[PDB]
Design a protein around this ligand. Structure first.
Ligand code: CU1
Length: 142
């Protein structure tokens, strides 16, 4: 259980009250976007949190550079295989945790992000269950 706090994920923005609209349940537990491995959607297909997939909402975007430090807050730092970062659905970078427990405050540097408006999906794969955690970050790269 955990989520991306900077640049803020969609669930982070819900939890911070930064969205103009009601996100529902997710605003009370941004750490909980858990779903089976292998998805490339913002909710991972977790039906409690389908709002996270809705691109029609006016999701706030964060202005970032092409290289950016991305920070997770983990409430339950499960043993981890990989952290996979996708840009608009395509795999961009992979960080190998080698089956180890990550720190509860974890920062990864993403580089070579394409300029303009994009959505980064961070997929956190748990090494000892079939679940991953799904975090979308709407960004404008310049
Ligand atoms: Cu968890």
């Amino acid at each position: 259980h955990g989520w991306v706090t900077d640049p803020p994920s969609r669930q982070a923005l819900c939890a911070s009250g930064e969205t103009s609209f009601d996100c529902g349940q997710i605003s009370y537990e941004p750490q909980s976007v858990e779903a089976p491995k292998g998805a490339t959607t913002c909710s991972g297909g977790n039906e409690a949190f389908a709002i996270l997939d809705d691109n029609s909402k006016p999701w706030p975007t964060t202005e970032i550079a092409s290289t950016v430090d991305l920070t997770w807050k983990l409430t339950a730092p499960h043993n981890t295989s990989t952290w996979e970062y996708f840009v608009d659905g395509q795999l961009h970078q992979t960080f190998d945790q080698k089956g180890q427990q990550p720190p509860t405050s974890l920062t990864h540097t993403l580089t070579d992000l394409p300029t303009g408006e994009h959505t980064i999906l961070a997929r956190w794969n748990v090494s000892n269950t079939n679940n991953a955690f799904y975090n979308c970050m709407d960004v404008v790269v310049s």
